[PDB]
Amino acid sequence: MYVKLISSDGHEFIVKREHALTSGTIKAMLSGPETNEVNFREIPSHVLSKVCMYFTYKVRYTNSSTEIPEFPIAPEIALELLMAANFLDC
Amino acid sequence: MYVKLISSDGHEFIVKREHALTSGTIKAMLSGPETNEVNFREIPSHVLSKVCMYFTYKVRYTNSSTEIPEFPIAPEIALELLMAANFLDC
Amino acid sequence: MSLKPRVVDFDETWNKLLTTIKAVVMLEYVERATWNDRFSDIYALCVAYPEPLGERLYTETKIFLENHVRHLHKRVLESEEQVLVMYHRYWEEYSKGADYMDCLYRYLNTQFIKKNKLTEADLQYGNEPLMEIGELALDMWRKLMVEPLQAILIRMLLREIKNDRGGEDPNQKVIHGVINSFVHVEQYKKKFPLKFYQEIFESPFLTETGEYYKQEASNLLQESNCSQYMEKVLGRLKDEEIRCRKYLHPSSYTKVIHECQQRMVADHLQFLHAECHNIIRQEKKNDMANMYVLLRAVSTGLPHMIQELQNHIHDEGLRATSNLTQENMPTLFVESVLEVHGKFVQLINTVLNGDQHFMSALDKALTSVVNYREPKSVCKAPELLAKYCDNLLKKSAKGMTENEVEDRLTSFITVFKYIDDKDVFQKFYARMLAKRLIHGLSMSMDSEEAMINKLKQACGYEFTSKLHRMYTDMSVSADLNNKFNNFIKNQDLGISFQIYVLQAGAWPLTQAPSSTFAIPQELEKSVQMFELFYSQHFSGRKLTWLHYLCTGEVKMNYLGKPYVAMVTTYQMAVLLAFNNSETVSYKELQDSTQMNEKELTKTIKSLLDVKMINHDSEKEDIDAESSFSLNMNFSS
Amino acid sequence: MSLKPRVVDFDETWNKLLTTIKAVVMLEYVERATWNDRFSDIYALCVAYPEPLGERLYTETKIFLENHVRHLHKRVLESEEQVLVMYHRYWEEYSKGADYMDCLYRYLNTQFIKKNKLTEADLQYGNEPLMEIGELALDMWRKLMVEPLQAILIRMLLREIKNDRGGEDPNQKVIHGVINSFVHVEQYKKKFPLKFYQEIFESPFLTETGEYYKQEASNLLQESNCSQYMEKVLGRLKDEEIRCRKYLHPSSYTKVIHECQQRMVADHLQFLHAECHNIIRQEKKNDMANMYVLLRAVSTGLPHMIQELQNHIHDEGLRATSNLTQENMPTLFVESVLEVHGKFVQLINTVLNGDQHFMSALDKALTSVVNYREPKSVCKAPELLAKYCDNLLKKSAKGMTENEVEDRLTSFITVFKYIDDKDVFQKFYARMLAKRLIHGLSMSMDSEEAMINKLKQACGYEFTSKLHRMYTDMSVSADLNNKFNNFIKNQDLGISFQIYVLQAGAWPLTQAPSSTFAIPQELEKSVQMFELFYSQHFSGRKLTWLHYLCTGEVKMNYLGKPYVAMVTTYQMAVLLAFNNSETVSYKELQDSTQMNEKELTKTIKSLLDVKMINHDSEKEDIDAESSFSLNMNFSS
Amino acid sequence: MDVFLMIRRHKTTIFTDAKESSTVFELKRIVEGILKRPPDEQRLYKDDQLLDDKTLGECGFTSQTARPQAPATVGLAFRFEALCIEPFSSPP
Amino acid sequence: MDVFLMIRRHKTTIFTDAKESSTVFELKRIVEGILKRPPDEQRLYKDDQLLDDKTLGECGFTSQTARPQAPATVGLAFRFEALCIEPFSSPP
Amino acid sequence: VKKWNAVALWAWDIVVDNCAICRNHIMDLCIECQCTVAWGVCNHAFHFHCISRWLKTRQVCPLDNREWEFQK
Amino acid sequence: VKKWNAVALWAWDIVVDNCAICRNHIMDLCICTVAWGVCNHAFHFHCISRWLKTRQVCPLDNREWEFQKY
Ligand SMILES: [Zn+2]
Ligand SMILES: [Zn+2]
Ligand SMILES: [Zn+2]
Ligand SMILES: [Zn+2]
Ligand SMILES: [Zn+2]
Ligand SMILES: [Zn+2]
């Protein structure tokens, strides 16, 4: 029911399938030819973690009747976040 | 197809089936439990012959549109004819 | 020796006859010559000269037969559990033997017994009376075979029948032969040929059948739902029909089935009516197919379930006819009922064997559905039904095929029968048709004529009398306009003129002209020419114009471009006052046109709305002093 | 290391990706971590810092795919008679691989190909463009698999399909997969997704199908009669339906069946309608059931056979409605049509699937049958139909159940619609109804009222306007006679008096006698009393008495016994003229009655015929001088 | 026309009806049908006149001479044996 | 109320949504669902405060303190060893 | 004298005292005779002399405006 | 002036010339508009009104009276 993701530094982050299904590149990597573990050698722990919180925020506030609050983006990590989003096609 | 009748004196008279069927008593004997031969111990040749002509006359003129002519009955044989008719149910 | 009566030894000939008949009853071989000799001896003894011993022969035969039958009874009693088969064998032997002695003793019956037999009237209004030897044999058989062993034989037959009902098939031949024997024994009795069979066997058999099938119905009900139980009921019915046709006499067949219908179906009529409330709502295509036949067998089964179907269709049609869009209500309303009707018709004929009552019960609800006043408008159903005609009768651009209209019209007739106040439909249809023809909106006369003929066939000539003259009126009117033009040729209007002559008895235009219109001089000449002409070819008549319905085309050259727009007669009269003066007051128009204030202002309002004229008074309300100016700058 | 763009070696990473995709196309095991690493490698290659290598990647991928596809083509060409199965296997392998690289090249496709792909509008209105790697792979597969081997593969597929038609079933999986692949290869094309499939396979397949079916038709026609051939046609149709659903793409299904209908059925329409002329006359319960569906498939098959049914029922109904007995014609004529209509309705609904046209075609003939003027009397059909109502609405001794009549009346309505001049029926119905009510011949008003309501529902209020007033007139009239008697109580007639106040409009008694009859004094008191009374409660109304229809009972006291006989009002005065003089001359009767000689002679003739009086003139013809004497010796 | 014929050979007698235009061959076929004797052995004697194996009308057998109450007379002989007929019993 | 919480053990991290009224044992059978370790061995530390197997609202985990954009903080340990958690990578 | 029954039509005097062609009372002489009542199958009653003259001009019923036919 | 079409009802003068009930012009003159009902029978609206206030049935065909058009 859950999938594990390992960052460039080896940190393990486990989230449900539907969290990961948002990202098109993740869908492809899980569609690749038992624990569903995927490593991200180009992404460190904190960036992948905040990508996990972005997934949680999105899946919570998509089709949600309540007002959607702003998601915090740290300026010192904004470039890495955006390039990671381009890599994950999300 | 036919039936042979033997008189008291052993004369043989062969007639069609319906002629025998005209007389109820002859129907009974033919219904008795290969030539279908029937003897008549109390009937001589001439009486049985004239009875055969009686059958012929009846079967010809029953349900016949033409006028039915009179059937001759000899007075010297009338008593035997009538007793034979009573015997043969006719 | 000959046929003359003579003194014959009774004892020796009697012994010979006894030997012969003893061989006969056992179906032993007998010589045909011996057969004829026995006939001769029988005849001799019948006419025995000292006294006719035919009574003695009858007594001797009866005694010998009684001894033989008693011996047969002893032999039957000896057998146990074999009684049925060996009794059947004895009956088969004995019937043929009895026929053989009947032929043997034909002379005795015809000459002695028949001449001494008591008539049927004496017996009905009344020593054992003399009977034929075959009748004697069967009667004594029934006395000494059927009566002494009747309980045992009935019990065995019922046991075998029950075993067959349990699937254990006994020999059909033996039991059927025994039953036919029961029929056979009293076959000589002219009155009540089946009395004995019904008395000794049929009644107890029917009682046991009813008991067994009541128990079977209880078991099947306790073990199955309504559908499974009813299917088992049908199976049992057909199986018992097969059983009866195999064994019982045909006359009892309809009885036994009836009994199986009574104790096993009718005893639970309430059960049948309890589950049918939902079996039809679910529309079980196959269940009502077998549910119909079961209720037909019982007397009161059908009517209650018939009404339940009416309730279902009443609601089913209502739902399909309640959410109609207020825009396209008419066209869809007809279609909504048609499919509701069309579906159930095929349902009734196929599933319910085309019962006439259900077809009748269908129309009992559809009429209540079509004529229901669902919308807030009172009795709007015929009105909205009427508007469907225009959709199929109005010439639309690239209109759909007239042939494809025709079958639609035929389908329309089906709904037509369900309307209550069909006369009210006619009035609405007439005025609505009046607009369609006066402007040529109908695609063709023939299409309208199809409706006229169909309606007349639907409700007689009188119901279509106004419409028929209505349709005919314009058809001839085409020639009248043409023939009127020939008069000008025969003898200058200056304008393009058309005219329709309307038969006042049919056109629903009872609005007589209250205000005396002043015909414009440009139109007055044509009025003069036609009225004089009309009397010429059609005398003794009176004409009356409805100017307000007359229509015409007006071309103005005062504008920068020639503009042509269709206008009414009152509209032309108002505008013609502007061809000489560019501004006209209200009173001048009233003087020129002689119109009442209400309609003239309404006519004036239309021109102002289209901006044909300019109202020179600041008030938006028009008064008697209102002045109006032409619109020299109008453009379209 | 992070996602920042950088200079990457194209050769080494390209070789690693090549190895990975080579394992992929063969569906070989690939490490998931290796899969993820290849993703990062692709991303790095796309964002290569010196220049995007995506264009270089696309070319390398296309070249490798071309080499792989050429090798696959060589392998397929090596196989013979095995081409289908192994090419199919390669198809699934390559399609799964193509999807895998489509997921693999997602970033490259989005960033490079999608951002540079030519739009659909540019292709429609305006170097090979950029295509998705999946689109590229499918297009090149079609280029190098389907195109080079297209003739061979189509030929093999057609051979296998024909073998299946011959009963030799090939492998469904392989050929069905190839058929679906034909759609699959161009499934990426937005416009005409089935264009290539229709172009290369569907059209030749349909051509061969039609030729094979035309040959199959020929063989079966030469080997079977109409019934056997049509049954074989139905079998072939259902078999081809199963075949198409088993093998072909669904979109072509309706096409192929259509083709199977065209070359195999309609090619001999002259034959289909040749033998239908007798198939319906013989009433083959099952043949037309399957004969109907075949003509529905073809465009023009149904209408010709539809009319032939109309001819059959036209003659069939005529025979059942021509030999009617002149005595009981009305009751049986209604019955005769009923089963003729009833049987065919169940025939049409069950056998012919309840086609609406046939039901319509049924009424086209029955109306022509019922309205037909078979007897020498002109248009006697509605008239004799009216007499049937009397038979079901005349109170007879021990009359059969009214409830059962209700069922008959409902059945009566069915033939009622078939009458053309329904108004004429109403006129005859009224007068026949006029007799029944005036003498109470009907069982009850309620039974008659059912006819009134049904007719109004059948043809509107107006068609039943007179009749409803007819029925209401007497219903209130019962109280009027009673209420009139109260007036005598409120205030001596000497006789028993009854009266019906008939309404001039509805009652069809147009004839008012010119002969000014003189009311007898014994009746003159009562008429005075009622006329004065009528104005009391019903002033403003004129009353007119039709004495000739009034009925009275006269008790003669001159005879030896008191005799009671009912005779008319004109017959009242005649006997009253004899209560004072036993002989009365013609002039005295004429002076007393004051009514016309013509009916007086008819009135006198009736009395003489029943021997009421004795004619005192020797001439059998009554003249103005004819004297008449009472019949003092009359007995009954 | 129907003609009624009684054929007699010794005590044996056979009654039948045939056509006046029928020849000896038809009645001979009757003989093989019942008695099963070949036609050549069969010899017809109308009184003492041998009949040619000739229609009954030609032989003199007509409806008037062949009646149900007065059947025609002819004798049958078999192999060549002279015709032998035994006279009937004498009524009292 | 839905509360979003992340649990950590060394470099292993699991994100899950639960109810504010859910107890610590809820978060624990989450642990057996994910990584099959017995609950007695599992111990949860809100910061340095060990939590008794007590609702999240009682533990201090509310909707405000547990958001999809800011999940709450809690650590996990097993059998009983000291809490050891490695900090995340440092962004530039 | 034993018993009698009476039947009599009911109509209003003022409502139906005129014929369409002449308006003279139907029971009275027509204007020209001042003569039996002629009945149409359309239930309209006119003087026989009046209807015959009208039929000569055209064969229609004046009130009905439809072809005339002598009911009685 | 470009074109005109004319529609005019047709009736015989002799058949109807006066109010049947009252010998007077039907145009608002009784011894009073033209009343109308489904019977299509026209009499002085004064006479029609007083009849309706007396009897609720048509004078000619004798049925319940309801107004048609005006
Ligand atoms: Zn007149
Ligand atoms: Zn006159
Ligand atoms: Zn008329
Ligand atoms: Zn008036
Ligand atoms: Zn007034
Ligand atoms: Zn009226």
CSV table of N, CA and C in Angstrom, one decimal, chain D residues 161-200:
chain,number,residue,atom,x,y,z
D,161,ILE,N,-9.6,-17.2,-42.4
D,161,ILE,CA,-11.0,-16.8,-42.2
D,161,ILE,C,-11.9,-17.8,-43.0
D,162,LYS,N,-11.5,-18.0,-44.3
D,162,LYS,CA,-12.2,-19.0,-45.1
D,162,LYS,C,-12.2,-20.4,-44.6
D,163,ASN,N,-11.0,-20.8,-44.0
D,163,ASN,CA,-11.0,-22.1,-43.4
D,163,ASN,C,-11.9,-22.2,-42.2
D,164,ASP,N,-12.0,-21.1,-41.4
D,164,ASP,CA,-13.0,-21.1,-40.3
D,164,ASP,C,-14.4,-21.2,-40.9
D,165,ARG,N,-14.7,-20.5,-42.0
D,165,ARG,CA,-16.0,-20.6,-42.7
D,165,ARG,C,-16.2,-22.0,-43.1
D,166,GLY,N,-15.1,-22.7,-43.5
D,166,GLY,CA,-15.2,-24.1,-43.8
D,166,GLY,C,-15.2,-25.1,-42.7
D,167,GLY,N,-15.2,-24.5,-41.4
D,167,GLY,CA,-15.2,-25.3,-40.2
D,167,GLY,C,-13.9,-25.6,-39.6
D,168,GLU,N,-12.8,-25.2,-40.4
D,168,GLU,CA,-11.4,-25.4,-39.9
D,168,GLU,C,-11.0,-24.2,-39.1
D,169,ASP,N,-11.1,-24.3,-37.7
D,169,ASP,CA,-10.8,-23.2,-36.9
D,169,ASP,C,-9.3,-23.0,-36.7
D,170,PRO,N,-8.8,-21.8,-37.1
D,170,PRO,CA,-7.4,-21.5,-36.8
D,170,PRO,C,-7.3,-20.9,-35.4
D,171,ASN,N,-6.1,-20.4,-35.0
D,171,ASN,CA,-5.9,-19.9,-33.7
D,171,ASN,C,-6.6,-18.5,-33.6
D,172,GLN,N,-7.5,-18.3,-32.7
D,172,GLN,CA,-8.2,-17.0,-32.6
D,172,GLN,C,-7.1,-16.0,-32.1
D,173,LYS,N,-6.3,-16.4,-31.1
D,173,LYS,CA,-5.4,-15.4,-30.5
D,173,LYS,C,-4.5,-14.7,-31.4
D,174,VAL,N,-3.8,-15.4,-32.3
D,174,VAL,CA,-2.8,-14.8,-33.1
D,174,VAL,C,-3.4,-13.8,-34.1
D,175,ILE,N,-4.4,-14.3,-34.9
D,175,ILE,CA,-5.0,-13.5,-35.9
D,175,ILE,C,-5.8,-12.4,-35.4
D,176,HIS,N,-6.5,-12.6,-34.3
D,176,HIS,CA,-7.2,-11.5,-33.6
D,176,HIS,C,-6.3,-10.4,-33.1
D,177,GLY,N,-5.1,-10.8,-32.6
D,177,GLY,CA,-4.1,-9.9,-32.1
D,177,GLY,C,-3.6,-9.1,-33.3
D,178,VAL,N,-3.3,-9.7,-34.4
D,178,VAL,CA,-2.9,-9.0,-35.6
D,178,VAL,C,-3.9,-8.0,-36.1
D,179,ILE,N,-5.2,-8.5,-36.1
D,179,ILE,CA,-6.3,-7.6,-36.6
D,179,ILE,C,-6.3,-6.4,-35.7
D,180,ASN,N,-6.3,-6.6,-34.3
D,180,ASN,CA,-6.3,-5.4,-33.4
D,180,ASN,C,-5.0,-4.6,-33.6
D,181,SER,N,-3.9,-5.2,-33.9
D,181,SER,CA,-2.6,-4.5,-34.2
D,181,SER,C,-2.8,-3.5,-35.4
D,182,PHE,N,-3.6,-4.0,-36.4
D,182,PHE,CA,-3.8,-3.1,-37.5
D,182,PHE,C,-4.4,-1.8,-37.1
D,183,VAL,N,-5.4,-1.8,-36.2
D,183,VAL,CA,-5.9,-0.6,-35.6
D,183,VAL,C,-4.9,0.1,-34.7
D,184,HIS,N,-4.1,-0.7,-34.0
D,184,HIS,CA,-3.2,-0.2,-32.9
D,184,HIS,C,-2.1,0.7,-33.5
D,185,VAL,N,-1.6,0.3,-34.7
D,185,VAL,CA,-0.4,1.0,-35.2
D,185,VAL,C,-0.8,2.4,-35.5
D,186,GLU,N,-2.0,2.7,-36.0
D,186,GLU,CA,-2.4,4.1,-36.3
D,186,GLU,C,-3.3,4.7,-35.2
D,187,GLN,N,-3.4,4.0,-34.1
D,187,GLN,CA,-4.2,4.5,-33.0
D,187,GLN,C,-3.7,5.9,-32.5
D,188,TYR,N,-2.4,6.2,-32.7
D,188,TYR,CA,-2.0,7.5,-32.3
D,188,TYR,C,-2.4,8.6,-33.3
D,189,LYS,N,-2.9,8.3,-34.5
D,189,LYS,CA,-3.4,9.3,-35.4
D,189,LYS,C,-4.7,9.8,-34.9
D,190,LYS,N,-4.8,11.1,-34.6
D,190,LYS,CA,-6.1,11.6,-34.2
D,190,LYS,C,-7.2,11.5,-35.2
D,191,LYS,N,-6.8,11.8,-36.5
D,191,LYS,CA,-7.8,11.8,-37.6
D,191,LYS,C,-7.8,10.4,-38.2
D,192,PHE,N,-9.0,9.9,-38.4
D,192,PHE,CA,-9.3,8.6,-39.1
D,192,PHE,C,-8.5,7.5,-38.4
D,193,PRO,N,-8.9,7.1,-37.1
D,193,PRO,CA,-8.2,6.1,-36.4
D,193,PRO,C,-8.3,4.7,-37.1
D,194,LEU,N,-9.3,4.5,-37.9
D,194,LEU,CA,-9.5,3.2,-38.6
D,194,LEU,C,-9.2,3.3,-40.1
D,195,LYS,N,-8.6,4.3,-40.5
D,195,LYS,CA,-8.3,4.5,-41.9
D,195,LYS,C,-7.5,3.4,-42.5
D,196,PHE,N,-6.3,3.1,-41.9
D,196,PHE,CA,-5.4,2.1,-42.4
D,196,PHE,C,-6.0,0.7,-42.4
D,197,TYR,N,-6.7,0.4,-41.3
D,197,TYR,CA,-7.4,-0.9,-41.2
D,197,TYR,C,-8.4,-1.1,-42.3
D,198,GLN,N,-9.2,0.0,-42.6
D,198,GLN,CA,-10.2,-0.1,-43.6
D,198,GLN,C,-9.5,-0.2,-45.0
D,199,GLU,N,-8.5,0.5,-45.2
D,199,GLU,CA,-7.8,0.6,-46.5
D,199,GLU,C,-7.2,-0.7,-46.9
D,200,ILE,N,-6.4,-1.3,-46.0
D,200,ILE,CA,-5.6,-2.4,-46.3
D,200,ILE,C,-6.3,-3.8,-46.1
